[PDB]
Symmetry: D2
Subunit: 287 residues, 4 copies
């Protein structure tokens, strides 16, 4: 068996791509910002594709979304106010809302078409999160939202950046700079945490290192971790910046008690997974 | 950039996903009696060994594979002196095992002389002279027969490392992945012995993975499951370690690092902290 | 620009395939006989795909259907009764019905799902041909239809075989044999003509030559010709067997007068195209 | 079988269609100052020259290309003595033109020394010694400059054959496809001279094709358009022949065959009947 007859050619590095059997195409939209496809794949189930890159799949998105959200949320001892930049399919919001401490969660995506198509075609991703009375969905460039938040003196406990990739995405490029992370720091409480996905350190080390150095220039505690996402073809790199709380100091017991006390149910993330993420070095080309 | 090329390897993975990998050069192509062998240069991963279309090892990421296959088992054993490797044709598994200063005798058994000979010639960064270490012996034989002979002879090893072609694709390795074969492996281990094998991938090939796992569990009281992403393969390779006496979960990072230091083992990846992460990270499965 | 992100991998020889950008998928059906896809391609417009092979495209099917049908129909001085084996999209029937001499045209396809999906999704192919009062559409294995025609003493003037390929198709394999062409001869009038597509002589010479020798064992006049069909990746080979009339003896004038007298309008086929088809050797591997 | 491989050339064609072609070997890879050159072996087509990812010629089907490019123009000319070839780096265009016993002087001008040198070394079935025929001269120069120099010098040819990289893809050949360049070609033809060029493909690249056609028509009173399927390219290559005096449509098959015989021309494809078919078959265009 080989992939086809109808296949997605998913870019990866420029020198490697994935060839993925497609069973159906549900939606194609050229938005003002990007090319959107919602399709069914044989190996990964339903997917969101943006500019040819799978952003999430039914079969493995929970690895991505739980790994993006819960280490930072569990590290903060009382996350009440949460900001999400990107996260158009709603799954980042879904995970953050599981924390019973959360009173307000704002999600800011530039592209109304991604959110509306996700609402319509990706119900296993959002799972109603867009309609939670604690949630607000804002259609705006996150750069502009953060500048307005600074003017307003707005502050959050946890900021989650769930954007398109730093190595491919023009629309997200301004949000991966040292200057942006300095703005993020200005809309965090003094014990705040930021987490971002940072592409991949194996295939895109220069872009990874640029995001890492921009977090380190602004946050005194930084954790790097990665999780293999089969549908993407690589282990996504995450970078967690913290003003006060050290994620490396949580024990599997402290994590599992915060999860239980806050009513958080997961498919992947646990205190032992947290320990593994805090101890596994990230991949690099070794020769 | 969207389509690597102009010359590309189409590397199978699941049957419903494959990798397209830019090729810069083709150094050797041999149809052996067992399999189709290619040694080539890739842009992303450097030089590769390809067997029946599957990358076995790449210069850029083989140390992730070989260190993860070898060192957890070798570090868990308090004094591994006698090591057996089944498969490992490029010599990098033997290279890693020989780093342990406790090792007195290492035997590697590959069915395919042509893989070993082309690796000797074209993959020096993989073997790094391991084939010619005076503690090493390279045997060309079906590992199935080698183990049958070892049992007749009463031979015993401390650590047995299975570095074979995949359980989901490889007819030549199929008989080495069974419950019956792991019962034969137990018979050629010392009472405190350890086995480790690669077991394909639990996300894309859970049925094949589970049959290897149930074959190990039937024969060993301690079974550890761990995985490591190997970029050039397109997935996290699953490893299964079976132990008769020593539990790899009981070894702290400081204990691992002290054993590596005492034994003179230098690595690019494996450390005590890596061991702790391998011991705690659940393996991937399709979640929907 | 390169094909994608969603692509058809169209087999060709086993050692060459085509990679074709897909814009939409209209229908997927696994029939009892074969895998059917109706899709839109960027280069070729809408296509019928059977077992991964494009059978016809909006942009180039008229090359195929006119080349299959009109040399044989124009060679016969009075084709009244026409049989088509295969031709599920209706375009072979469409072309044959243009000949004003035709009183009865029967089309026999094994697969109801191909005909019904073509009716629904390929109107530029059938163009109403299935509803012409001179046409009958029969769902049957053509092998069985021809055996029943022999029992009935049924006779035709022109028989057009428009089947799936001799080199790939199990369902059509019995219709490409010497014994089948002997049956065809039995349901032709003594001045009858047969024409079949025969795959490709460059990539599949053995299968081509088998069809050719089966026509030659049964028909004293045989013409070989080929036409490049871009969507397929090759020049389709045709073999015309004739009991009486020599297609090599028509002049561009005799063809253009038969076409005008019979009211036949074409996009490609003319008397000069006939002359070229009768004189161009077919492709073979030269080394 | 559905996906050729494991090692494959991804050959561009239209941007919305490409060919996947199994590769058996890579003999040479050179980045010249002008283009990326690969000489490789394909399963379907044998040895190939590839320039910027496009197959230029294959052992199995190059004679269809070279015979169709050269012989209609050469047979239409009643006595072609002086021949100029622009491009034709593998030497097969020169090989075909030299078959005509009337030819006294043939000059081939390629911009890229590396294409000619690698063809000499690796494509002997294409040049077949043509580079070393005493009637031949190989010049390494931009054909644009060669023709500017020829005009200054008052040089004239009987037949000019343009065998360049494609008008739709090739920056190095772009200036040779213009109306202005065909006016310079007229100035270096004898009064009864003939030009022929390949012109890409009218089905996939009709705009580029039409601009070459209108450039020829502006400068020549007789223009013949014909095409031939070249399997390894994925399309029927379009040719455009411009003539000052002799009409290729007026030559019957018997006249063609007699000229080929008198001149000692042996071919694998081209005959008088082929000429008649080329003269009568309309070129392909998208019909919807
Ligand atoms: C699907 S998760 C990634 C999301 O990041 C969003 N995105 C990309 N750039 C920006 C931006 N500058 N501000 C907010 N959202 C963005 C995209 O629209 C997408 O839905
Ligand atoms: C490259 S590492 C995998 C190796 O497993 C080897 N192998 C596969 N099957 C067997 C077997 N039955 N016995 C020993 N080696 C084998 C292959 O020849 C290959 O070199
Ligand atoms: C699309 S044109 C080719 C057609 O040949 C038809 N076909 C294949 N084998 C047979 C058969 N044995 N009898 C009749 N039609 C056939 C297929 O169903 C298809 O629609
Ligand atoms: C292989 S046949 C096509 C040839 O056209 C040649 N070519 C392309 N542009 C020019 C040019 N401007 N002058 C002469 N040769 C050229 C290329 O180097 C190639 O070898």
């Amino acid at each position: 068996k080989v992939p086809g007859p109808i296949t997605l050619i998913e870019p990866l590095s420029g020198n490697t791509s994935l060839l993925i059997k497609i069973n159906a195409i549900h939606s194609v939209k050229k938005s003002p910002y990007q090319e959107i496809i919602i399709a069914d794949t044989e190996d990964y189930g339903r997917v969101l594709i943006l500019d040819d890159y799978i952003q999430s799949s039914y079969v493995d998105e929970q690895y991505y979304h739980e790994s993006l959200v819960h280490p930072a949320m569990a590290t903060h001892p009382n996350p009440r106010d949460v900001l999400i930049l990107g996260g158009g399919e709603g799954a980042t919001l879904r995970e953050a809302l599981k924390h019973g401490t959360v009173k307000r969660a704002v999600m800011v995506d530039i592209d109304r078409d991604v959110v509306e198509l996700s609402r319509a075609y990706l119900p296993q991703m959002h799972q109603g999160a867009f309609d939670d009375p604690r949630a607000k969905v804002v259609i705006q460039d996150g750069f502009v939202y953060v500048e307005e938040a600074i003017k307003a003196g707005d502050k959050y406990d946890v900021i989650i950046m769930d954007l398109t990739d730093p190595y491919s995405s023009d629309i997200a490029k301004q949000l991966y700079t040292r200057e942006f992370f300095a703005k993020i720091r200005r809309i965090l409480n003094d014990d705040g945490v930021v987490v971002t996905q940072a592409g991949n350190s194996f295939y895109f080390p220069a872009e990874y290192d640029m995001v890492l150095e921009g977090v380190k220039a602004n946050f005194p505690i930084v954790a790097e971790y990665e999780v293999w996402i089969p549908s993407f073809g690589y282990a996504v790199n995450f970078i967690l910046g913290s003003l006060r709380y050290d994620p490396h100091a949580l024990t599997p017991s402290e994590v599992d008690e915060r999860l239980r006390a806050r009513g958080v149910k997961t498919a992947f993330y646990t205190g032992r997974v947290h320990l593994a993420l805090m101890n596994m070095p990230i991949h690099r080309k070794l020769r």
